[PDB]
Amino acid sequence: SAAQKFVKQVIREAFLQDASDIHIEPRQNDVQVRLRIDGALRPYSTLPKGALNAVISVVKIMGGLNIAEKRLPQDGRVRYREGAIDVDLRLSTLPTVYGEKAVMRLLKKASDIPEIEDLGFAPGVFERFKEVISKPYGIFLITGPTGSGKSFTTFSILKRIATPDKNTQTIEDPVEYEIPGINQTQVNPQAGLTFARALRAFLRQDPDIIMVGEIRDSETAKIATEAALTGHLVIATLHTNDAAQAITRLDEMGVEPFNISAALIGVLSQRLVRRVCEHCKVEVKPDPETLRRLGLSEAEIQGARLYKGMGCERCGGTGYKGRYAIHELLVVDDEIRHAIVAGKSATEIKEIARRKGMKTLREDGLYKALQGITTLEEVLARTI
Amino acid sequence: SAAQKFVKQVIREAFLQDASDIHIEPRQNDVQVRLRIDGALRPYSTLPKGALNAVISVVKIMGGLNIAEKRLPQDGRVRYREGAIDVDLRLSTLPTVYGEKAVMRLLKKASDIPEIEDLGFAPGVFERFKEVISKPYGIFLITGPTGSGKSFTTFSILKRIATPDKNTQTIEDPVEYEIPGINQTQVNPQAGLTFARALRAFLRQDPDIIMVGEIRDSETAKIATEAALTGHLVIATLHTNDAAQAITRLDEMGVEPFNISAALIGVLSQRLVRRVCEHCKVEVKPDPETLRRLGLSEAEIQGARLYKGMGCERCGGTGYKGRYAIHELLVVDDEIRHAIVAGKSATEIKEIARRKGMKTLREDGLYKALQGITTLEEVLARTI
Amino acid sequence: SAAQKFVKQVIREAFLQDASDIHIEPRQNDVQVRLRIDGALRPYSTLPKGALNAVISVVKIMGGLNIAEKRLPQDGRVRYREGAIDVDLRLSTLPTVYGEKAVMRLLKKASDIPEIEDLGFAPGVFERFKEVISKPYGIFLITGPTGSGKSFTTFSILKRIATPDKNTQTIEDPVEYEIPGINQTQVNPQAGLTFARALRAFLRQDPDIIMVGEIRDSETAKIATEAALTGHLVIATLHTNDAAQAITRLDEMGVEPFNISAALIGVLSQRLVRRVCEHCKVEVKPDPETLRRLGLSEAEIQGARLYKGMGCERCGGTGYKGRYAIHELLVVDDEIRHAIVAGKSATEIKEIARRKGMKTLREDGLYKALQGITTLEEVLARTIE
Amino acid sequence: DPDIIMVGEIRDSETAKIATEAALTGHLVIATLHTNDAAQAITRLDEMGVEPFNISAALIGVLSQRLVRRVCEHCKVEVKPDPETLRRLGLSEAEIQGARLYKGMGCERCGGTGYKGRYAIHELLVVDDEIRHAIVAGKSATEIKEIARRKGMKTLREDGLYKALQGITTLEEVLARTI
């Protein structure tokens, strides 16, 4: 039963190695253990096959799960105590043929969230970001997958808006960060505690500020928007292919455009692209046609270079140390506010914003590759 | 558990400041106790995080909830009418990164009862209000905020029809919205006297007029409606914010649609949207697609301009000049009674009245926005 | 021993003949013994009811089932080895008037899983296929009728990404495709662990890759793809007679159409037609009744050729041997994603998809039959007509 | 691991529910359905309380041969079918209008019944995607049968009535078979 302690080491190290998640998972003889370093699970160690049930006992005990329910999966709130952690970690266990799988999404701290600028918001792009989060109320749409960086933006906004004078309350599946000035709540749509339910719970906590981990049901958008419309500042996320689509998407989702318009101040498209570690960065030259389409033109193409995440100790072995986000910012002026209610397509909205000086995910991903931040490997893999 | 010391310094100040809520915040080392006042927080007292947990149990105690269960969210409400303390507390807890937030929402002092014309309903609504009360039987259902809408306005209906010569009674817990000429009941769910039980007497006593302060039981919803079936004037408060919603909800309560449909004669709503300066107004597009999606009369879809303040020494500071009363009257005819059974949507059931000139919150609101008094955004903020 | 020889040798042959499952099907003297060859049971042997008791008991003894109870249903799991075989088995029984029935499922190991390059794509579409499944997140939807070979395709991609280094996680019933080091969840619906409960846990179990070996539970489809909708890499097994239809099927399974337009990277509708056994692959046909029903291209009619499963023993007496998957690949580009975000039907998606290169399921089969793998007759059976 | 699944008698809700689950994973659930009409057999799972997700994934088609008293062909009495009877039934036009009933008057080939023993009325319902929607929606036996029936497809009602309308059976009997 060695993992009664080993797991705690996994959990501890997941924080120390800058992982977002803790995983202890079995093999035929031993158990594969990984930390989600810079967004990807890495081979931390292994532990004895039988020890996997000890692992389970650790993760179940710390979060109050029925220690005996190794027959079906359960989840909870880990009052986790080891090293750097004094965190309600986001616990789950699941029975597997070689012993039950043990997981804790890390409940990271405010210090683990890159700023609303740091993520890579180009001057004009950032100005628009600020226009939105500086309002006393309204909605900010952010969009992409887990690993889109939307979490970083969303909770970096909290770092920039969740103050002592604002009742910040978040809605997250599960809570990813531990931030001051805020009451950050754990959400589970599979249990019926969807973001729509959590949004009602949120409003009953009488907030000034809201963060929403995912807009999925029409209601998650609509009630996050209601919060804005009850005088709150609302920051919320979707999974679309652009900023423009976040508006189009809320219309596609049946989120009444008049509520989108009532609150919407602006929209951020977002994607993480892995960031090349300076201890492994390798210069390579990109293709002119790809580059034309990505927004370079001839002179930049002649001098264009990409930087590859070749691999080093300082990148967790991923080739990249951390990730940066690709950013596209739309401000809802009246041409756009019209576009919201008119049900305009993502192309229509994006092109208006580009006319106004907005850079797209495609142009930004590229620029970051050219800059020495990433490569048109990761960019392309993680962009539109 | 004191804990309560900090909370109590706050129930003192929060009630004294006419706060919207008392916030026991599950923070990193501590617990903030904050005051949401005039729409936003200011901090007042601080507990240790150990005391957070103590308070989570305290508010669960006040509602008779499972106080031992410090990890899972629960709710209810309590009659906090102890002199200086004269606001009900909405009980809610919600689990975060450091334990549940403990909430004592201030269920704002009744602010008693308006004489319904006082609402400032557009003429096509008010005169029809008068028309609805000219047929004093069945259900006259009203929505809106505690202290500025719920029983505030359903009792306004009573004030206009429930004369001393009518057997009129209400159900409240505690009684706050008071009308001379009328009986007002305190519900004692603790005794087993839930609002359903209170209603069982209202039905059994054969009144001319029945009032439900909060339709808060399957049996409450059912009984109020059963009484209405026979023609009792069952005026009732439905703790939601829109007449259109109120028209179909009792079916969700398990109430037979026979009695619901047979019962209704009209449903009202009211809102506080924020006004603008007018003098220092900012032209904002009354976008017709917004307005069309809303289902507004063309008089408002096309016949319009919105105005926003600049935030603005004549507003403020959100760009709006204080609270603006917006109203609705969904007059119920035979076709509406068919719609109740059908379960027509809030937009549709609302749209029907709007197209008759009966300005709904959505029209009376948006109308007022479209007239340049407020913005469609603030009205949509509330006419969601 | 007589009991060991039947079980060990039928199992050894079950795998050699490409069965998916071994069946001992009770009869009043004699029990039909069949192998689920190419997706359907075939005459391996027969067995006496005396052997139902001895052999069904062996299945039960192996499985961990109750060897006496002719009045209750059963299920379990073992590891099996003899001759050329070292592959796990799923064991189950059900009381029968003839003596209790038994099945031993061939729980193919990871070493039995094909590559992404074995999915039959022509150069253009293959390069795109590769580009699609090589992505770090999103769903690659693998679809088709029961008897489609979906677990190979499903696991060929899992395998691509199934390194113990990464948190690869898949739901099995019971576990078969090991590679240890990747999570191999074993459902237990009696406890509450259905495939949906399992995936519910997969989301809560935050692996890098979410896989469903068999979506028997429609909620499993919802959740597996939900994992993609949320940003995980997803590979999963779902019914479809048209890849465009598969996209619509995701919408029908509760997978949000809106997030699908971002999360779906590719769709593949498959089906098995029986391979003409390589040991008796006689050049015959294409047949005019078959051609008429199918709509075969002249390129395929007058150049490409069919074969007849004349008879080769390891075919179970039919002449057909080996599952032949057909691969209708739909690359999910902007037209498809728009059709998806718009919530479009199989027809609407298919038509834009067709214009964008979606050779259909029926057509891919026609081509492949004539490439000398199967018979168009089999192509008829699994599609039209 | 069925290719083909059978129920000797689907006698209850757990059985209907599970039989339908049994079909869901792609197996041919052939079954004794406690019914007298093929289209009725299709709708029935909803009626049984079968969880509808199983119903949607399960149904492919229905077989009938329900017997009618066979008209005594050799003393068959001309009876006009009512073409409205036939239309209302939903038959394929020719089998409405050119159609003619008979009834036996009693005979050396039927005795005091008017019918020459019995006739098995034919039917094949086929559940395509539109029928799938109809089943889940709770559509009637007449509607499901009427649809499958087109293109001259025989049903307990169309074949039945069709043969009734030749003088093999009486529309009456057929209608009793397909009410």
Author numbering:
A (entry chain A), B (entry chain D): 505 to 888
C (entry chain F): 505 to 889
D (entry chain C): 710 to 888
Excerpt from the publication:
The TFP assembly ATPases are part of the extensive AAA+ superfamily which form molecular motors, using the energy from ATP hydrolysis to drive mechanical transformations. The domain structure of T2SS and TFP biogenesis ATPases is similar, in that they comprise one or more N1 or GSPII domains at the N-terminus, followed by a C-terminal (CTD) and N2 domain- which comprise the ATP binding site. Here we present a combination of X-ray crystallographic and cryoelectron microscopy single particle reconstructions of the PilF hexamer in two states which are used to build molecular models for the complete PilF hexamer and chart its structural transition on binding of ATP.
The TtPilFAMPPNP structure was then used as a starting point for refinement against the apoprotein map, and the final model was designated TtPilFapo; structures of both forms are shown in Fig. 3. Of particular note is the fact that the part of the structure associated with the ATPase domains is more distorted from C6 symmetry than the N1 domain section. A comparison of the two density maps revealed that they are similar in overall shape and dimensions, but the apoprotein structure is shorter and wider than the AMPPNP structure, indicative of conformational change between the two states (discussed further below). The apoprotein structure showed a consistent contraction towards the center of the complex for all domains- readily apparent from a superposition of both structures and also an analysis of the displacement of the centers of mass. Displacement of the N2 domains appeared to be generally greater than the CTDs: this observation is significant because it is this domain which is linked to the N1 domains in the N-terminal half of TtPilF. It therefore appears that binding of AMPPNP to TtPilFapo triggers an expansion of the hexamer, outwards from the center. We conclude, therefore, that the transition from TtPilFapo to TtPilFAMPPNP is better described by an outward shift in center of mass, particularly of the N2 domains, rather than changes in the relative orientation of adjacent CTD/N2 units. This is accompanied by rotation outwards (mean value 14o for ring 2 domains), which leads to a wider aperture at the base of the structure.
